[PDB]
Scaffold this active site. Sequence first.
Site, PDB file in Angstrom:
ATOM      1  N   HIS A  45       0.525  -1.334   0.135  1.00  0.00           N
ATOM      2  CA  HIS A  45      -0.209   0.166  -0.055  1.00  0.00           C
ATOM      3  C   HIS A  45       1.306   0.920  -0.239  1.00  0.00           C
ATOM      4  O   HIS A  45       0.501   1.933   0.191  1.00  0.00           O
ATOM      5  CB  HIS A  45      -1.360   0.194   1.162  1.00  0.00           C
ATOM      6  CG  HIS A  45      -0.880   0.179   2.485  1.00  0.00           C
ATOM      7  ND1 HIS A  45      -0.555  -0.572   3.638  1.00  0.00           N
ATOM      8  CD2 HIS A  45      -0.541   1.804   3.062  1.00  0.00           C
ATOM      9  CE1 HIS A  45      -0.192   0.721   4.130  1.00  0.00           C
ATOM     10  NE2 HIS A  45      -0.330   1.654   4.518  1.00  0.00           N
ATOM     11  N   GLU A  59      19.446   6.450   7.886  1.00  0.00           N
ATOM     12  CA  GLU A  59      18.545   8.165   8.150  1.00  0.00           C
ATOM     13  C   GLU A  59      18.585   7.381   9.784  1.00  0.00           C
ATOM     14  O   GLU A  59      17.571   6.665  10.079  1.00  0.00           O
ATOM     15  CB  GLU A  59      17.099   7.441   7.395  1.00  0.00           C
ATOM     16  CG  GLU A  59      16.495   9.249   7.326  1.00  0.00           C
ATOM     17  CD  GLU A  59      17.731   9.879   7.989  1.00  0.00           C
ATOM     18  OE1 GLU A  59      18.090  10.354   8.546  1.00  0.00           O
ATOM     19  OE2 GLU A  59      17.562  11.141   6.979  1.00  0.00           O
ATOM     20  N   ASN A  61      17.592  11.225  12.223  1.00  0.00           N
ATOM     21  CA  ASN A  61      16.750  12.130  11.824  1.00  0.00           C
ATOM     22  C   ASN A  61      16.405  12.707  10.730  1.00  0.00           C
ATOM     23  O   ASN A  61      16.988  13.398   9.318  1.00  0.00           O
ATOM     24  CB  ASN A  61      17.662  13.267  12.451  1.00  0.00           C
ATOM     25  CG  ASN A  61      16.890  14.685  12.616  1.00  0.00           C
ATOM     26  OD1 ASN A  61      15.405  15.532  12.371  1.00  0.00           O
ATOM     27  ND2 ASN A  61      16.879  15.151  13.982  1.00  0.00           N
ATOM     28  N   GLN A  64      17.610  16.818  10.276  1.00  0.00           N
ATOM     29  CA  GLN A  64      18.881  16.762  10.512  1.00  0.00           C
ATOM     30  C   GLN A  64      19.830  16.311   9.100  1.00  0.00           C
ATOM     31  O   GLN A  64      19.774  15.027   8.956  1.00  0.00           O
ATOM     32  CB  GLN A  64      19.052  17.244  11.376  1.00  0.00           C
ATOM     33  CG  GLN A  64      18.373  17.455  12.371  1.00  0.00           C
ATOM     34  CD  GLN A  64      18.861  18.390  13.910  1.00  0.00           C
ATOM     35  OE1 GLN A  64      19.497  17.617  14.413  1.00  0.00           O
ATOM     36  NE2 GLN A  64      17.959  19.046  14.382  1.00  0.00           N
ATOM     37  N   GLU A  69      24.051   8.846   5.854  1.00  0.00           N
ATOM     38  CA  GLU A  69      22.678   8.698   4.959  1.00  0.00           C
ATOM     39  C   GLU A  69      23.170   8.666   3.579  1.00  0.00           C
ATOM     40  O   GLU A  69      24.274   8.777   3.068  1.00  0.00           O
ATOM     41  CB  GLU A  69      21.339   9.744   4.829  1.00  0.00           C
ATOM     42  CG  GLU A  69      21.398  10.557   6.008  1.00  0.00           C
ATOM     43  CD  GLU A  69      21.990  11.968   6.620  1.00  0.00           C
ATOM     44  OE1 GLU A  69      23.120  11.301   6.441  1.00  0.00           O
ATOM     45  OE2 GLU A  69      20.689  12.002   7.023  1.00  0.00           O
ATOM     46  N   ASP A  93      -0.549  -7.588   1.765  1.00  0.00           N
ATOM     47  CA  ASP A  93       0.370  -6.266   1.877  1.00  0.00           C
ATOM     48  C   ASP A  93       1.692  -6.262   1.908  1.00  0.00           C
ATOM     49  O   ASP A  93       2.492  -5.718   3.424  1.00  0.00           O
ATOM     50  CB  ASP A  93      -0.312  -5.448   2.515  1.00  0.00           C
ATOM     51  CG  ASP A  93      -0.098  -3.501   2.627  1.00  0.00           C
ATOM     52  OD1 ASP A  93       0.859  -3.238   1.995  1.00  0.00           O
ATOM     53  OD2 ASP A  93      -0.531  -2.956   3.957  1.00  0.00           O
ATOM     54  N   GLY A 186       2.803   6.867   8.369  1.00  0.00           N
ATOM     55  CA  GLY A 186       3.798   7.119   8.827  1.00  0.00           C
ATOM     56  C   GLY A 186       5.178   5.870   8.464  1.00  0.00           C
ATOM     57  O   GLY A 186       6.092   5.695   7.686  1.00  0.00           O
ATOM     58  N   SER A 188       4.113   2.868   8.274  1.00  0.00           N
ATOM     59  CA  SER A 188       3.638   1.423   7.125  1.00  0.00           C
ATOM     60  C   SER A 188       4.516   1.148   5.921  1.00  0.00           C
ATOM     61  O   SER A 188       5.800   2.075   5.955  1.00  0.00           O
ATOM     62  CB  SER A 188       2.783   2.068   6.442  1.00  0.00           C
ATOM     63  OG  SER A 188       1.344   2.379   7.029  1.00  0.00           O
ATOM     64  N   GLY A 189       4.697  -0.413   5.996  1.00  0.00           N
ATOM     65  CA  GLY A 189       6.201  -0.628   5.361  1.00  0.00           C
ATOM     66  C   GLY A 189       7.268  -1.290   5.636  1.00  0.00           C
ATOM     67  O   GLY A 189       8.054  -1.752   5.466  1.00  0.00           O
TER      68      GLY A 189
HETATM   69 CA   LIG Z   1      19.322  13.348   8.124  1.00  0.00          CA
END
Ligand SMILES: [Ca+2]
Length: 240
Positions: A45, A59, A61, A64, A69, A93, A186, A188-189
């Site tokens: 979804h 990741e 934050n 910031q 990353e 799903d 947010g 999800s997944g």
């Molecule tokens: Ca960051």
Amino acid sequence: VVGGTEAQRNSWPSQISLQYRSGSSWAHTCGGTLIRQNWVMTAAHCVDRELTFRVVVGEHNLNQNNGTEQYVGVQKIVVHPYWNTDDVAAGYDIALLRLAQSVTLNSYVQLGVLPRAGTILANNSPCYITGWGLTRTNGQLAQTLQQAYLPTVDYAICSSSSYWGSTVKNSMVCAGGDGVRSGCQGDSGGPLHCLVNGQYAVHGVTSFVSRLGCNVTRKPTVFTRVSAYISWINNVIASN
Ligand SMILES: [Ca+2]
């Protein structure tokens, strides 16, 4: 995640942020689990909308520079062929994203360990949900990655009338439902990490919560059960 705590930076190195292009910027929309250096496991979804997506590994934050990353575009999207966006309760799903480049592994970036096929966890098994989802029902995304302790609720309890009834299938994992801690929009997944024989493994892909709210007593967060899809996952990676 509602009722969460900030995760240490290298606790969950297989967690990724799935983001879509939004004009001049990028927006977080979902989590996922790095399972190969060029493959991410997420919820179907999450890729329902015809958007431009990228994955961020390393990741912590979203607002910031963490100095860790790596950013990589999504080159191909394989949704489970039985997925239906108007019926999340049917299951399936799950989706796999092939990355345009292979990412580099380090203490912030590792592969998620998946359970063996068919594994089901005992009731009340210790698990953590992780993600940048809303910190309150109808709230806002977290800035820092959050974690919450969500013990599993087995199928016979979770599918009972007081809990989710017929809406939960055995191809799903339920966890939480205490009314205080939960996944939220947010998240999800992303992964559900559960401690088994001394090692954390990703047993779930976050899929849904009550339409009434995220942290609702007896409506635990529901996840796609990874151990039901191991042959599907291997079949895609092999054939792609
Ligand atoms: Ca960051």
